[PDB]
Amino acid sequence: ANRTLIVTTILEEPYVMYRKSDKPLYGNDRFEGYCLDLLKELSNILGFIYDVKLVPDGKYGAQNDKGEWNGMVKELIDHRADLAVAPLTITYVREKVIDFSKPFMTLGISILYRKGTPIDSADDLAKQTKIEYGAVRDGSTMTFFKKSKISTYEKMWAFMSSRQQTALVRNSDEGIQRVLTTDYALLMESTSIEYVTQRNCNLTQIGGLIDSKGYGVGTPIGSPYRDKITIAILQLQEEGKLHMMKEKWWRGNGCP
Ligand SMILES: N[C@@H](C[C@]1(C(=O)O)C[C@H]2OC[C@@H](O)[C@H](O)[C@H]2O1)C(=O)O
């Protein structure tokens, strides 16, 4: 039989979540969400079974000064996993070191905050000095700011970096808790802002999208699966299945 593929992933609602049960769950059955449905579809098309493993360091992946990667990106570079199936952003820096599939979803960075402020854009956010802001540590949003040559975003990076110990949060849940309980705005991908703001009516998006990009399945460079995964994603795209999956996991609208 075909070797069981190792899938690296990360907990992120509604992509990958713990299933709630009153009885024991083991292996892949512990997880549910958009990315688990995606895996069920992809595996049917490609002819494999798989083993879902949460990334040990709990990170998406960024490179340090020495050029060393961490998170799911490192798992792929080091051939610890066959595929990364997660809300994993397709970026220039990552594409040089792993092989991404074509995108299964598009999104852009925007701002998550509470309601009631006059802040209406990243320019407003960077200029004012009343509320702090940051991003999840070692993801693509952090890297977007780290790499930017746009003045507003360079300032925002300098600010985030100066207060990194505090401004850069471990995960999105810590980020949202910080937004809810302190004067802190979270830089977050728009599809995640969409999800949270239809559930917690105290939260809102600030401004529009500051970029545009996609999520893709990651594989190690040279992977014999990437092209087959791309073909399968295009099939799911054209058949309307990706759209159906988004509707299933984001349903519905709960806030004014
Ligand atoms: N997709 C990113 C990870 C992350 C981000 O950096 O925004 C981290 C986490 O942040 C919240 C929201 O943007 C989304 O659920 C997640 O995106 C990546 O591939 O590095």
Curated annotation (Swiss-Prot):
Extracellular topology ranges: 118-256
The keyword Heme is annotated on this UniProt entry: no
Cysteine pairings via disulfide bonds: C201-C255
Glycosylation site list: N2, N202
Additional note from the record: The postsynaptic actions of Glu are mediated by a variety of receptors that are named according to their selective agonists. This receptor binds domoate > kainate > L-glutamate = quisqualate > CNQX = DNQX > AMPA > dihydrokainate > NMDA.
Gene name in the database record: GRIK1
Quaternary assembly: Homotetramer or heterotetramer of pore-forming glutamate receptor subunits. Tetramers may be formed by the dimerization of dimers. Can form functional heteromeric receptors with GRIK5. Can form functional heteromeric receptors with GRIK4. Interacts with KLHL17.
Modified residues (Phosphothreonine): T197
Record-listed Phosphoserine modification sites: S161
Functional description taken from the UniProt entry: Ionotropic glutamate receptor that functions as a cation-permeable ligand-gated ion channel, gated by L-glutamate and the glutamatergic agonist kainic acid. L-glutamate acts as an excitatory neurotransmitter at many synapses in the central nervous system. Binding of the excitatory neurotransmitter L-glutamate induces a conformation change, leading to the opening of the cation channel, and thereby converts the chemical signal to an electrical impulse. The receptor then desensitizes rapidly and enters a transient inactive state, characterized by the presence of bound agonist.
GO MF entries: glutamate-gated calcium ion channel activity; glutamate-gated receptor activity; kainate selective glutamate receptor activity; transmitter-gated monoatomic ion channel activity involved in regulation of postsynaptic membrane potential
UniProt keyword annotations, A-Z: Cell membrane, Disulfide bond, Glycoprotein, Ion channel, Ion transport, Ligand-gated ion channel, Membrane, Phosphoprotein, Postsynaptic cell membrane, Receptor, Signal, Synapse, Transmembrane, Transmembrane helix, Transport
GO biological process, one term: chemical synaptic transmission
Chain sites annotated for binding L-glutamate: P87, T89, R94, S140, T141, E189
Family: Belongs to the glutamate-gated ion channel (TC 1.A.10.1) family. GRIK1 subfamily.
One Gene Ontology cellular component annotation held by this UniProt entry: kainate selective glutamate receptor complex
Organism: Homo sapiens (Human)
Protein name listed in UniProt: Glutamate receptor ionotropic, kainate 1
Compartments, as annotated in UniProt: Cell membrane; Postsynaptic cell membrane
Domain of life: Eukaryota
